[PDB]
Design an enzyme around this catalytic site. Sequence first.
Site, mmCIF file in Angstrom:
data_model
loop_
_atom_site.group_PDB
_atom_site.id
_atom_site.type_symbol
_atom_site.label_atom_id
_atom_site.label_comp_id
_atom_site.label_asym_id
_atom_site.label_seq_id
_atom_site.Cartn_x
_atom_site.Cartn_y
_atom_site.Cartn_z
ATOM 1 C CG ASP A 89 -1.910 1.231 1.044
ATOM 2 O OD1 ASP A 89 -2.447 1.585 2.729
ATOM 3 O OD2 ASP A 89 -2.180 1.358 -0.017
ATOM 4 C CG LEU A 92 5.918 5.334 3.643
ATOM 5 C CD1 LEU A 92 5.211 5.135 4.969
ATOM 6 C CD2 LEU A 92 6.603 4.889 3.218
HETATM 7 O O1 LIG Z 1 -6.697 -6.861 5.577
HETATM 8 C C1 LIG Z 1 -6.151 -6.036 5.298
HETATM 9 N N1 LIG Z 1 -7.113 -6.049 4.561
HETATM 10 C C2 LIG Z 1 -6.037 -4.623 3.488
HETATM 11 O O2 LIG Z 1 -6.294 -4.258 2.205
HETATM 12 C C3 LIG Z 1 -5.117 -3.635 4.101
HETATM 13 N N2 LIG Z 1 -4.533 -2.340 3.898
HETATM 14 C C4 LIG Z 1 -3.801 -1.908 4.838
HETATM 15 N N3 LIG Z 1 -3.577 -3.280 5.655
HETATM 16 C C5 LIG Z 1 -2.362 -3.514 7.090
HETATM 17 O O3 LIG Z 1 -1.991 -2.494 6.615
HETATM 18 C C6 LIG Z 1 -0.823 -2.961 7.122
HETATM 19 C C7 LIG Z 1 1.030 -2.979 6.934
HETATM 20 O O4 LIG Z 1 0.353 -3.037 4.816
HETATM 21 P P1 LIG Z 1 1.693 -1.251 4.192
HETATM 22 O O5 LIG Z 1 2.836 -1.570 5.128
HETATM 23 O O6 LIG Z 1 1.297 -1.492 2.958
HETATM 24 O O7 LIG Z 1 0.731 0.450 4.231
HETATM 25 C C8 LIG Z 1 -0.736 -3.882 8.254
HETATM 26 O O8 LIG Z 1 -0.927 -3.718 9.383
HETATM 27 C C9 LIG Z 1 -2.422 -4.108 7.980
HETATM 28 O O9 LIG Z 1 -3.249 -4.609 8.937
HETATM 29 C C10 LIG Z 1 -4.701 -3.770 5.445
HETATM 30 N N4 LIG Z 1 -5.379 -4.803 6.122
#
Ligand SMILES: O=c1[nH]c(=O)c2[nH+]cn([C@@H]3O[C@H](COP(=O)(O)O)[C@@H](O)[C@H]3O)c2[nH]1
Lengths: 172, 171
Positions: A89, A92
């Site tokens: 997402d 980072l």
């Molecule tokens: O179940 C989920 N569906 C999603 O669409 C989602 N988007 C972000 N997360 C949360 O993002 C954290 C790590 O994602 P990023 O480092 O890419 O921000 C993790 O801690 C995740 O819990 C999600 N969990």
Amino acid sequence: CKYDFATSVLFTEAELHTRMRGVAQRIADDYSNCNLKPLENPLVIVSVLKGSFVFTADMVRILGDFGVPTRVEFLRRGKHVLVLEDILDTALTLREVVDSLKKSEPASIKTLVAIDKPGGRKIPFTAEYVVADVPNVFVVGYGLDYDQSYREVRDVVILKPSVYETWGKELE
Amino acid sequence: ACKYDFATSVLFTEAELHTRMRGVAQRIADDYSNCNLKPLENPLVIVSVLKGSFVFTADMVRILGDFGVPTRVEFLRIRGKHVLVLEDILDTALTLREVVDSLKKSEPASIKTLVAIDKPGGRKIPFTAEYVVADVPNVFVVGYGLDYDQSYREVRDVVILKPSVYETWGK
Ligand SMILES: O=c1[nH]c(=O)c2[nH+]cn([C@@H]3O[C@H](COP(=O)(O)O)[C@@H](O)[C@H]3O)c2[nH]1
Ligand SMILES: O=c1[nH]c(=O)c2[nH+]cn([C@@H]3O[C@H](COP(=O)(O)O)[C@@H](O)[C@H]3O)c2[nH]1
Ligand SMILES: [Mg+2]
Ligand SMILES: [Mg+2]
Ligand SMILES: [Mg+2]
Ligand SMILES: [Mg+2]
């Protein structure tokens, strides 16, 4: 829908495995000049986060069936290292992790995510291998969690606000 | 008889294990329906041990999910909670005991053990798994999470490891 706390099933289990077989053929092609053997020169899998254990378990057995032998490691020189994440997402985490796998300079280092959320970037990151794209919606399943739950979902789906709200007034 | 090279025999396959896992998932469903298992509120805490149980953990939480056993995973490679520890292979049962003892000092609701491979003849201390997927003799195995020096975890089947591989490699 097919579930009782979702509004839509983005990607099913039959779709991801089919896609992961496609990426596995890409990684088997790109890593054919590496001489990948068990023990001596096996590809390293870096399994970030806590929700990447489903994607990692599925991927290491799809790469093995594509002749790409691996050795896993979990983070929650002369080696081609491969970083795996459940979802990309903000991007980072990988950046740091990727830049941090260079201080022990590998042979080569690329990134493999099952779910790419290119619409939620804060710094410009691009993984060499993505199994599937998804719009800026919140999707649980295939290891993904909402407060440590719903990881066991075989599909990538979208949680109904009610589920996010109904759990709201139990916290305090 | 081996569908590989690094092995002499194929003890159990990905298909043999998966069928055994649905039957153990039902029993887990039977014996845990009185605890009122619900996501977020009171999910069944699956404590995955080692680096190898992660494969058996990924497939088992998707079988327990089919029978309606919602879970929240934790990796140790809990208060007022029903905790279910998972481990790929059970040998001396020492590693299992300490993890469970340490878990016991948080006072989880219950606490049982589930293994995919048990080597009952490798016991240093006595120990019984509440649930078991398969039994193997006293031979060294690899695959389905079981590794030979961080390798062979990707094998879809639990197989006996050929001696040439770790006489040549262990020097
Ligand atoms: O179940 C989920 N569906 C999603 O669409 C989602 N988007 C972000 N997360 C949360 O993002 C954290 C790590 O994602 P990023 O480092 O890419 O921000 C993790 O801690 C995740 O819990 C999600 N969990
Ligand atoms: O790859 C493997 N194939 C095997 O057959 C095997 N037998 C024992 N082990 C290792 O011993 C540990 C046993 O832990 P316990 O104290 O819980 O029995 C396990 O957790 C492993 O580290 C094996 N690893
Ligand atoms: Mg993640
Ligand atoms: Mg989360
Ligand atoms: Mg029972
Ligand atoms: Mg159901």
